[PDB]
């Protein structure tokens, strides 16, 4: 099987990769994309807060990312006096830019293979305890500048180790954000959806000291001067235009065996899917009644239904595409290739071992994320009580330090209905008793009660009385904590998982990981020239493709670009999701599009055949000349499976049209000074 | 203001129409479509029971129409032991074909203008309504007089709101038997979810056979009747359809109103449609519940539910498309140019004022029209007990008007016709829908014409107690005896008593005024029509549909419902599979079809390993065009018309060519279902299969 898609290490583009790109239309070289010697594209593409991507678009450190990447910083700086979430935020001067605590932006200096130094493991199961040894060893040892940091990452399930030389800037200030109605237009409804019309962006500026080096916040740090910044094209995109996406994809698992994928589609995914669906249908029941609750639980209904949607997407995608079956055809060929290579002694039993360990780990795996999806994350009291549980066996200083931070849960009791909570505890704990593997169930077996009884006695329903339970010396507060029926029920299930499930889940998990690394090694050996790329691991990658529409269903085709016309079609006055700010509607009605327009219409978004995943939020999409044309912010629904199985016919990434970005910055915000700071170019003639 | 779309009188195709068709790729001619000298297409396209279209596809009377046109006939011979609704039905030889009482199929012999004869003496010698009164005498006068054969019938129809009158000589066949139908899961795949929706994957068809006496002439049913031999039948193409293929649809579109004033559209959108929508929604919700929980109740209500449901959803789409497209403003803009053209023609005395008068009367009639809608929807159509009661109400005034013998004639005829009414009547169902609809009439109807409602009816559930309208044996006893007594027996029944309070409240306090104003609006509409005909002579003006034979043409063409979204013009069986939901009410698939799909056993009906199912084109259709043939450039059958797409559900009021499409079953899928699925190859051997693209 020839692998489709690809998330490529930016330093290994020569050969196959560059040939594909130039045949896809790329004009620049591999050298322009990465180099240790001179300024390349990678110098304009930093890691954003360890979980997202951003890109430099001016020589004064102006960076662009998604609105939902900068959401937390924006929300942190907003209140009912200065409601930036709603109104947007724009710094007219650089001194008006708002500092952000715990926001870092990381640049890659150099990408360095250190697999040899890390691997003194084999010829000895008790020493990947040695490569942890060797990693720490080589980390301090590798050639680094004083103001730089070394990071060793595991590639290919542990067959390759690469050290990154990085610079971690710790002074990143909010420069600009559109109003939420623009930045998350269509919120939940349009999540994972194409056609999409969302101006999902926000801007920050990277600050440094007088030596243009990484530094903590100082009141007289200066704007960072990049080694490279991306010029912004005004010419727009067309179907079949070459696109390149550079970013920090978090995690893929493209080389899983069929048994793993079967466990996803037939057991683990359906398990979690029903759980969040329960929490959701019952949340939407009260949100359909009161509007003060609707504004309350909207951000949280969002956060949970997001993954609810992704998993449905993944299951349907995998079912529709027959991934399990394609995996099986591969495994029939794999076995043959092993046999013909004379490598049965190394690889001969890989598939048979997989099946037995995967068959066996199933009840643990399902029980595990029933605990997770009911206790740890979705039932907000059990999640509160669980947070309390994990500070219990920090064992006094470490306990109290953790507890001063745990008392600061002001913002969640604020806008929390325990009337609502009582609903989710009922439905979700019911599911756990009547659906979870009965052999690992604890204090179930029948207690349909202790439902409003727990929200009627727990010192965890309001915050002031929550403080009153955590009051007391280092001790007795524990005695007070186990007094609570709420915590006693969280403890109960947590003790059970931690002794009856975790001890043996983790064991089989290591057996399977060991198998997988041999499997990956076997595939790389037996299938050269089949476009095998390392699974994502939050490191800088390059992917490429083209502007291309797709078909989601029989007789339905989606074109690859949207327009403001399409947003006005979705416009609903006063709607929480589809309202449109007055100036934008004014701007539409007068077609006041400036240099951003295209024949009396304004481009908004477009989609591409680039292979992205979570972590690629805010990633730059450049054209063949290396100019910014788009801003990545999502994947289409039909290809949310792309971590397990990439299908080039329906996998698409969704990007904001940069013409739309600048339009919003300019004609909407009136922040033209941010644009004069940019390089506006015309690559098409 | 050049009028888009169109539904043309088939004898008038020469000139503008024919040029347009040949330009689209038509190879045949006007004389091939309609002729009195020799056979033509019209001979192969009869009216199917006066509400749908059908087409002859064999020289032994085999006709093809929609599954929902055959539906009432299918439901009528279905039961628990023989559920043809669910299982389909297939006459393996001609004697197994099922006779249908009260099913006729009408062929058009000739199309004859008789305007002069009809408007003879109505010039101004009268009083608008006794003008209509004189019109009806000329109509009856010509119908009796016009030359026809003995076995034929005349029917005079009104065109252009009364500016033109055309007589149709016809042959009405009365022995039409059921030959074939697919299971409902193929016949209405997707049911109400997919109704009025593209993409569509529905095999919407059924087959009948026309029978005649030994002179190849119309005959009431008889075991000695033989297959009718037609003057022409449509060969069926196996070479399929590609985008831009010329298509022509011939059929009997029921009603269209392309030439309404602004104020008519506003009344539709703002008050008539929302009322009727809300009323039908409550009725259907109640009915859906009982039918998803009981097949026997589903066999009872299948036909009655589908009829109601179809317009309920149509009206949602129609109101949606009229608003979205701003038809009201579009016409306002036309009307500001209309009168600018009545002054340019020096005709302000006949016209001009029209638009002002319309606004006057349309505003005035508003609360009556609404209150009327509530009465028709709640008493006449959706609540079956009130429905039967209201017929007794009318039969009451036959006695008063036409006499005791007329009473007992129409009473005994009413009783024999209530047979199948009670076969399909479920007391439990009708009372729950009664409880919901009477609530709506009281609370949401205009209060200044409300009847006994005094202000709260509370719940009178058991008026189904011992109203004798609930049961057939009951109903007969109520009407047993002489003309009086029976009339007082009826007056005592708690059911009919209730309907009486609503009925004479309507007939005395709403109906008189509504009629008065509507007559004025209609008359004004007649003149408005003539005005537009004069001041816009070469603007492709076609007569509104009026359930007469029309031709429309265009091409296989997709469309774009929304930004970045394109709908392709053809669907395939794998698209049906994508929608498959095991054991689902609407989207379950039969077992045999799933096997055929998995085997890709398509035979000569397949196209590179795929099975076409439906397609769409720019033909202008409306209700009545159900079952119309779509023919290619050479006059071969390539599709079977059966719906319109969501975006064009407005097309009776406003036609927009970029989004109005008709939906057709691909004839390759029809034959596939007849053949591979049912094993009814013998019906195929009857047809002439051709290859026009070879
Ligand atoms: N209620 C139904 N689904 N009827 C069948 C389809 C009828 C078609 N929409 C015309 O009218
Ligand atoms: N289904 C309808 C046709 C239409 O509405 O287009 C009958 O006739
Ligand atoms: Cl423009
Ligand atoms: Cl993504
Ligand atoms: Na495309």
Residues A175 and A185 in one domain: yes
Range of the domain at A385: 251-528
- Is residue B563 within 8 angstroms of chain A, CB to CB? yes
In total, chain A counts a number of residues equal to 685
Is the Cβ pair A553, B198 closer than 8 Å? no
Q: How far, in Å, from the CA of A683 to the mean position of ligand 3?
A: 19
Tell whether A194 is within 8 A of chain B (Cβ): yes
**Read out DSSP for A438-497?**
TTS--S----S-SSTTTTTT-TTSSSHHHHHHH-SSTTTHHHHHTT-HHHHHHHHHHHHH
The residue among A172, A190, A194, A170 whose CA lies nearest residue A181 is: A190
> Which among B563, B574, B578 is the nearest to A569, CB-wise?
B563
Alpha-carbon torsion angle A206, A208, A214, A216, nearest 10: -90
Q: Based on the fold, state whether residues B453 and B563 are members of the same structural domain.
A: no
Compute CA B570 distance to the chain's CA centroid, rounded to the nearest angstrom: 25
The residues, any chain, with a CB within 8 Å of residue A394's CB and separated by 6 or more, are: A402
Nearest 5°: the CA angle A235, A662, A246 is 75
Concatenated DSSP letters of B446-512: -GGG------------TTTTT-TTS-HHHHHHHT-SSHHHHHHHHHH-HHHHHHHHHHHHHHHHTHH
What atom of ligand 1 comes closest to residue B192's alpha carbon? 3
8 Å CB contact between B662 and B644: yes
Distance from CA of B1 to the nearest CA of A (A): 25
Q: Of the candidates A72, A163, A66, A164, which has an alpha carbon nearest to the alpha carbon of residue A655?
A: A66
**In this structure, what is the dihedral angle of CA atoms B413, B419, B424, B428, given to the nearest 10 degrees?**
90
CA A454 to chain centroid, in Å, comes to 35
**Has B682 been annotated as catalytic?**
no
Task: Name the closest-CA residue to atom 8, ligand 1.
Answer: B643
- Closest by CA position to B216, among listed B247, B257, B175, B169: B175
Q: How far is A183 from chain B (nearest CA, A)?
A: 19
Cα gap A509→B590, rounded to integer Å? 44
Do residues B64 and B108 both lie within one domain? Answer: yes
* Co-location of B533 and B543 in the same domain: no
| A128 and A270 both lie in a single domain | no
Cα distance between residue A316 and residue B410, in whole Å: 61
d(CA B546, CA A445): 70
Query: Could you check whether the bond before residue A195 is cis, i.e. omega within 30 degrees of 0?
Result: yes
Q: Are strands A680-681 and A232-233 parallel, antiparallel or unpaired?
A: parallel
The DSSP result for A273-322, as a single string, is HHHHHHHHHHHHHHTTT-HHHHHHSHHHHHHHHHHHHHHHHHHHHHHHHT
Rg of chain B over CA atoms, in angstroms? Answer: 26
Per the DSSP assignment, residues forming a β-bridge with A208 are: A222
Considering only CB atoms, B570 lies closest to which of A195, A549, A555, namely A555
What single string gives the DSSP state of each residue in B533-559? HHH-TTS---PPP-SS-EEEEEEB--E
Alpha-carbon distance A148 to A46, whole Å? 14
Whole-number Cα distances in Å, A275 to A280, A299, A492:
9, 19, 20
Contact B571 A555 (CB under 8 A): yes
In this structure, the answer to whether residues A329 and A449 fall within a common structural domain is yes
What backbone phi and psi angles, to 5 degrees, belong to B584?
A: -75, 145
User: B566 and A553 in contact by Cβ < 8 A?
Assistant: no
**Alpha carbons A303 and A297: distance in angstroms, whole number:** 10
Binding-site residues, ligand 2, Cβ < 6 A: B 621-626, 643-644
Rounded to the nearest angstrom, the minimum Cα separation between A552 and chain B is: 10
Contact indicator for A316, A642 with CB cutoff of 8 Å: no
Q: Please check whether residues A246 and A272 belong to one and the same domain.
A: no
Give all strands (DSSP E) within B102-224, no chain letters. Answer: 105-113, 153-159, 164-173, 176-181, 206-212
Residue B201 with chain A: CB contacts under 8 Å: 554
Distance CA B34, CA B40 (A): 5
| Inter-chain CB proximity A553 and B199 less than 8 Å | yes
Does residue B525 sit in helix, strand or coil? helix
Residues of A catalogued as catalytic? 68, 200, 617
* Ligand 1 in reach of B43 Cβ (< 6 A): no
Query: How close does chain A come to B243, measured CA to CA in Å?
Result: 13
Asked if B571's CB is within 8 angstroms of A556's CB, the reply is: no
Q: Write the CB contacts of B479 (distance below 8 Å, at least 6 apart in sequence).
A: B411, B414, B415, B486, B489, B490
State the SS3 of B570-610. EEEHHHHHHHCCCCCCCCCCCHHHHHHHHHCCCHHHCECCE
Of B563, B564, B571, the CB nearest to A554: B571
Look at residues B537, B568, B601 and tell me which one is the last residue of a structural domain. Answer: B537
Give the experimental resolution in Å.
2.1
Helix %, strand %, coil % of chain B (to 5): 50, 15, 35
**Same domain, yes or no, for A366 and A376?**
yes
Among A504, A528, A552, the domain-final residue is: A528
Instruction: State the total domains in chain B.
Output: 2
Locate B481 and state its tokens.
Answer: 């005896």
Whether residues A186 and A273 share a domain: the answer is no
**CA–CA separation, B486 and B492 (whole Å):** 10
Tell me how far apart the alpha carbons of residues B80 and B88 are, in angstroms, rounded to a whole number.
13
SS (H, E, C) B339-405: HHHHCCCCCCCCCCCHHHHHHHHHHHHHHHHHHHHHHHHHHHHHCHHHHHHHHHHHHHHHHHHHCHH
Q: Residue window 565-584, chain B: list those with CB within 8 Å of chain A.
A: 565-572, 574-575, 578
Cβ proximity of A34 and A41 under 8 Å: yes
Which residue numbers in chain B precede an interruption (C–N > 2.5 Å)?
453
A556–B568 CB contact, under 8 Å? yes
Half-sphere exposure of B569 (CA within 13 A, CB side): 21
- Of the candidates B68, B201, B620, B654, the residue annotated as catalytic is B68
The coordinates were experimentally obtained by X-ray
Residues of chain A with Cβ-Cβ distance to B566 below 8 Å are 556-559
To the nearest 10 degrees (0 to 180), the angle between helices B483-492 and B494-509 is 90
Query: Which candidate, A564, A656, A567, places its Cα nearest to that of A185?
Result: A567
- Selecting among B175, B204, B430, B632, the annotated active-site residue is B204
Contact predicate B429/B504, CB 8 Å: no
User: Which residue among B254, B642, B648 has the greatest number of ligand 2 atoms within 8 angstroms of its CB, and so is best to mutate?
Assistant: B642
- Report whether A255 contacts A523 (CB < 8 A): yes
Neighbours of ion ligand 3 (CB under 5 A): A 593, 597, 600
H or E element: which one contains A334?
A: helix A323-341
Which residue from B8, B218, B269 is spatially nearest to B103, judged by alpha carbons?
Answer: B218
- Cα B530 to chain centroid distance, Å, stands at 27
Separation of CA B565 and ligand 4 centre (Å): 22
Query: Which of A190, A322, A555 to mutate: most B Cβ within 10 Å?
Result: A555
Do B307 and B175 share a structural domain? no
Q: Tell me, rounded to whole angstroms, the distance of Cα A570 from its chain centroid.
A: 27
Residues of chain A with C-beta less than 8 angstroms from the C-beta of B198: 555
How many whole angstroms from its chain centre is CA A335? 35
Domain boundary (A528, A557, A592) is at: A528
Say which ligand is closest to the CA of A551.
5
Residues B590 and B663 in one domain: yes
Q: Report the C-alpha gap between B56 and B43 in whole angstroms.
A: 8
Q: Is B564 on the interface with A (CB under 8 A)?
A: yes
| Catalytic-labelled residue, pool B626, B628, B652, B656 | B626
Q: What is the DSSP letter of B693?
A: T
Instruction: Based on the fold, state whether residues A221 and A279 are members of the same structural domain.
Output: no
């Amino acid at each position: 099987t020839l692998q489709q898609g690809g998330m490529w290490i930016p330093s290994l583009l020569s050969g196959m990769n560059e040939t594909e790109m130039k045949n896809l239309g790329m004009k620049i070289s591999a050298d322009d994309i990465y180099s240790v010697n001179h300024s390349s594209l990678k110098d304009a593409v930093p890691h954003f807060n360890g979980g997202c991507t951003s890109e430099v678009i001016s020589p004064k450190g102006l960076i662009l990312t998604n609105h939902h990447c900068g959401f937390d910083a924006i929300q942190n700086h907003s209140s009912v006096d200065h409601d930036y979430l709603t109104n947007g935020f724009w710094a007219m001067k650089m001194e008006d830019e708002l500092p952000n605590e715990n926001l870092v932006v990381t640049f890659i200096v150099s990408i360095n293979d250190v697999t040899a130094q890390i691997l003194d493991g084999v010829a000895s199961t008790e020493k990947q305890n040695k490569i942890q040894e060797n990693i720490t060893k080589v980390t301090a040892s590798f050639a680094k500048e004083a103001w730089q940091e070394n990071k060793v990452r595991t590639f290919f399930e542990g067959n390759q180790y690469i050290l990154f030389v990085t610079e971690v800037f710790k002074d990143v200030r909010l420069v600009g954000a559109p109003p939420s109605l623009i930045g998350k237009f269509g919120s939940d409804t349009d999540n994972w959806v194409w056609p999409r019309h969302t101006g999902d962006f926000s801007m920050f500026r990277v600050y440094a000291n007088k030596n243009n080096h990484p530094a903590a916040y100082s009141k007289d740090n200066v704007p960072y001067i990049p080694k490279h910044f991306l010029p912004v094209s005004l010419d727009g995109v067309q179907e079949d235009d070459f696109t390149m996406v550079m970013g920090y994809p978090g995690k893929t698992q493209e080389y899983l065996p069929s048994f793993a994928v079967a466990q996803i589609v037939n057991e683990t995914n359906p398990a979690k899917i029903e759980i969040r669906e329960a929490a959701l249908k019952v949340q939407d029941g009260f949100m359909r009644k009161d509007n003060a609750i609707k504004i309350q639980y909207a951000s949280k209904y969002a956060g949970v239904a997001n993954y609810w949607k992704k998993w449905i997407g993944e299951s349907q995608g995998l079912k529709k595409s027959n991934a399990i079956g394609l995996k099986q055809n591969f495994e029939k060929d794999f076995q043959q290739k092993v046999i013909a290579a004379g490598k049965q002694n190394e690889y001969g039993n890989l598939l048979a071992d997989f099946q037995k360990y995967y068959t066996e780990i199933t009840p643990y795996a399902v029980s595990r994320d029933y605990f997770n999806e009911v206790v740890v994350k979705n039932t907000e009291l059990l999640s509160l009580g669980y947070k309390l549980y994990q500070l219990e066996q920090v064992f006094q200083a470490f306990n109290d330090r953790k507890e001063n931070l745990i008392k600061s849960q002001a913002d969640f009791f604020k806008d929390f209905n325990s009337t609502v909570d009582e609903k989710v505890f009922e439905q979700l704990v019911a599911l756990y008793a009547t659906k979870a593997p009965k052999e690992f169930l604890p204090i179930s077996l029948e207690y349909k009660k202790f439902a409003p009884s727990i929200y009627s006695k727990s010192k965890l329903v309001d915050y002031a009385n929550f403080k009153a339970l955590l009051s007391g010396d280092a001790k007795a507060v524990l005695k007070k904590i186990s007094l609570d029926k709420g915590y006693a029920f969280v403890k109960s299930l947590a003790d059970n998982y931690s002794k009856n499930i975790a001890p043996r889940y983790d064991e089989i998990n290591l057996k399977i990981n060991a198998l997988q690394r041999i499997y990956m090694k076997a595939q790389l050996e037996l299938y050269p020239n089949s476009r095998i790329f390392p699974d994502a691991n939050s490191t800088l990658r390059v992917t490429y493709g083209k502007v291309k529409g797709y078909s989601p269903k029989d007789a339905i085709y989606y074109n690859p670009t949207t327009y403001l016309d399409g947003a006005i079609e979705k416009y609903i006055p006063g709607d929480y999701e589809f309202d449109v700010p007055k100036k934008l509607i004014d701007l539409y009605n007068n077609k006041d599009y400036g240099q951003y327009g295209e024949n009396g219409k304004l481009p908004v978004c477009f989609i591409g055949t680039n292979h992205t995943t979570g972590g690629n939020s805010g990633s730059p999409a450049v054209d063949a000349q290396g100019n910014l044309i788009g801003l990545n912010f999502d994947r289409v629904w039909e290809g949310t499976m792309s971590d397990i199985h990439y299908d080039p016919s329906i996998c698409r990434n969704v990007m904001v049209d940069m013409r739309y970005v600048l339009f919003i910055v300019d004609k909407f915000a009136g922040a033209k000074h941010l644009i004069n700071e940019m390089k506006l170019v015309h690559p098409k003639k």
